[PDB]
């Protein structure tokens, strides 16, 4: 009877840090998948199953819209088979991903004079994430042999670090809102 509400996740006022990424489910609607592809307001619009056109020529069991902010330079890691700090410890697409990644520069909203420190990424983790895993732990990370006994200090690091989004940042270091669409019948073209 009505549109899938992509205005809820795309034009949302606040976005989530990558370590604690948000995920919306999308059911029982129809989604015009070419008012996103023909927008032109998106720096990035890659898909990994089949085409943004034949996608709205199909129905699916359910659709996922994951959202988060990262550095523009890290968007190359939101893709199957990548590595790096974001794909390993924060948000991991599976090797067989069928969906679309969308990204736009957000330097007007998410950057601040003096640095915007509310966006965080996970810097320290002993081992890689599984695909579509969310880790929101803040347990002190033990980098040496001695246990930390719950005290931040040497070899005893808080695992989350801040992107200090300042406006004067070079564009590869500016904030990028990202949305990932997953496809696995409730919504169609």
């Amino acid at each position, epitope marked *: 009877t009505n549109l899938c509400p992509f205005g809820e996740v795309f034009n949302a006022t606040r976005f989530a840090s990558v370590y604690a990424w948000n995920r919306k489910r999308i059911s029982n609607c129809v989604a015009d998948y070419s008012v996103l592809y023909n927008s032109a307001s998106f720096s990035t619009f890659k898909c990994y199953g089949v085409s943004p056109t034949k996608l709205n020529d199909l129905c699916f069991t359910n659709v996922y819209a994951d959202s988060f902010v990262i550095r523009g330079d890290e968007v190359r890691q939101i893709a199957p088979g990548q590595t790096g700090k974001i794909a390993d410890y924060n948000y991991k697409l599976p090797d067989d991903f069928t969906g679309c990644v969308i990204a736009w520069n957000s330097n007007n909203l998410d950057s601040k004079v003096g640095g915007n*420190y509310n966006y*965080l990424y996970r810097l320290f983790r002993k081992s890689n994430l599984k695909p579509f895993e969310r880790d929101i732990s803040t347990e*002190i990370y033990q980098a040496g042999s001695t246990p930390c006994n719950g*005290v*931040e200090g040497f070899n005893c690091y808080f695992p989350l670090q*801040s992107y200090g989004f300042q406006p004067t940042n070079g564009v590869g270091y500016q904030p990028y809102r990202v949305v990932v669409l997953s496809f696995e019948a409730t919504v169609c073209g």
Partner: antibody
Amino acid sequence: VQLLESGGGVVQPGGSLRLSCAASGFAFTTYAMNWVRQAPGRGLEWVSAISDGGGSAYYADSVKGRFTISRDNSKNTLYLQMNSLRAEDTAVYYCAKTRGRGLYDYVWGSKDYWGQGTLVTVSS
Amino acid sequence: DIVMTQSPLSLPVTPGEPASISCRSSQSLLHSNGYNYLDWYLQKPGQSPQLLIYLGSNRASGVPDRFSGSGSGTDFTLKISRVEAEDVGVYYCMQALQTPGTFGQGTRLEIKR
């Protein structure tokens, strides 16, 4: 790292004010914050602490009830609401961030950077 | 409430000489995991307190190496290996263990010239 404090002045006895602390240059959402106060020429006395995302708050027994500390992580601001103010609550009021974020780095503990200070006087 | 008593309350010192300030607590401050929950703050004239020493003997970020803390359990010492004119101020110890944070009376460090 900055902790710039607002509010403060006079309030008639028995009345109410709210101090504000606007933080910049650090994570803030990850740190605990405190309020400490100094009476003119008297030494420091701790007042209250609040954890990372509200949730846990502590108070000295001399102020439990009238003083409530809160923060808004979106606006990067810490707050202290005061009530039933006396002449014994006239003091300089310091926000301070606690040093570590480990469990056992207690939210009321070591205070890493302190704000400029805002004076709150209380008299007819 | 834990009681903190420093000694002495007035420390006159000549530049280039050492200074040392003793704190004592009524309850033991050893271990909430193996550390001493003792802090040393300094308050220069007209300024806010700054952290010098935390967890007993750890130098805070940017504090000069001439500052040092020592001791365990109940008797603690802050030592200034060489006093400089810019060190004038009041030095407070503080416990960081139990819920009412409590400070010492303060040590007024006066500079002899």
